[PDB]
């Protein structure tokens, strides 16, 4: 089966702001990747093995709005640049890659899956360079192997002249280490 | 919701069309030089290529385009008119073998459909099933390069 994805917006600007202050989100959750928003930026959060993970530079140390009020982070690691909350009820988790493939696929905020070649433990190159504006909002998103298992979480673009030729990611290994600490 | 694959029909048959790069592509042996229907009347083909068994019209309403493959994977996936996904191992520029052979019936009416890579990107257009005694074990396809080239 080929990797395909689709996006659905669940709420708007004002509803987002209210929910941010209230910390109470009664909306129904579905999917493996959640489109997430603070008051300053929107990025992604991936559910892997029951934990909803995202980028620390995006979430900081914030709680996540849930139907039971705000939920404190389960994990925080300023160094690995990770934060994790319990996966929301309704979400579906991806599972870590166990095939060691180097042919990866990044899922963007717009639900496009782009191929990247693993060129290191935390780097991969875009087979088709794209402007960084395309990658804007994808931090925390998943890098999948051909089987659809999680290899890493998109962290930063390696860009020049405004075009990204490579990406920097947090390999799934750092996740286990963060939980272990 | 918008679709990348259109299930199309002529008076004679039914097959598929795939939208790639803003063009609705299909097999010349299905459509011919026929025109495509629209609420404002028929729209003529933008591209006709009997040689490559390829024709294309401007993408219709309710459709979205597929992105061409750029990863060169050989693990392809053919999508049928019933939305069935069939894993195909690429054997050549325009040939691939079904990982698990299927009776011809299973692949009937799917020409024009897409052959996707692990990223869901267009690798080629299903041109014809290569079968032995009613069993499709391989398929012929039009690589995206031809489409990109024809444009």
């Amino acid at each position: 089966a080929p990797i395909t994805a689709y996006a659905q917006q669940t709420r708007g600007l004002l509803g987002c702001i209210i929910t941010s202050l209230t910390g109470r989100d009664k909306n129904q959750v579905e999917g493996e990747v959640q489109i997430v928003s603070t008051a300053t930026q929107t990025f992604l959060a991936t559910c892997i093995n029951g934990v909803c993970w995202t980028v620390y530079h995006g979430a900081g140390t914030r709680t996540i709005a849930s139907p039971k009020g705000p939920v404190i982070q389960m994990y925080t690691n300023v160094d690995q640049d990770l934060v994790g909350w319990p996966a929301p009820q309704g979400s579906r988790s991806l599972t870590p890659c166990t095939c060691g493939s180097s042919d990866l696929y990044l899922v963007t905020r717009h639900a496009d899956v782009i191929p990247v070649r693993r060129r290191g433990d935390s780097r991969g190159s875009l087979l088709s360079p794209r402007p960084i504006s395309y990658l804007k909002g994808s931090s925390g998103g998943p890098l999948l192997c051909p089987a659809g298992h999680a290899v890493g979480l998109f962290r930063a673009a390696v860009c020049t002249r405004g075009v990204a030729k490579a990406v920097d990611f947090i390999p799934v290994e750092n996740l286990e280490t963060t939980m272990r600490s | 919701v918008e679709g990348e694959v259109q299930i199309v029909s002529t008076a004679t048959q039914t097959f598929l069309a795939t939208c790639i790069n803003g063009v609705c592509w299909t097999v010349y042996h299905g459509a011919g030089t026929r025109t495509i229907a629209s609420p404002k009347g028929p729209v003529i083909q933008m591209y006709t290529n009997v040689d490559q068994d390829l024709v294309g019209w401007p993408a219709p309403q309710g459709s979205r385009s597929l992105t061409p493959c750029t990863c060169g994977s050989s693990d392809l996936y053919l999508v049928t008119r019933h939305a069935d996904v069939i894993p195909v191992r690429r054997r050549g520029d325009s040939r691939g073998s079904l990982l698990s052979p299927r009776p011809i019936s299973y692949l009937k009416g799917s020409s024009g459909g897409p052959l996707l890579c692990p990223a869901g990107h267009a690798v080629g257009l299903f041109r014809a099933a290569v079968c032995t005694r009613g069993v499709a074990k391989a398929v012929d396809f039009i690589p995206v390069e031809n489409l990109e080239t024809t444009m």
Binding site: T4, Q8 | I7, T35, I36
Partner: peptide
């Protein structure tokens, strides 16, 4: 004759 669209397939399976 004209080719008519009798249906559509969404590869991602988007319900929306």
């Amino acid at each position: 004759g004209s080719v008519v669209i009798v249906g559509r397939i969404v590869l991602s399976g988007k319900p929306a």
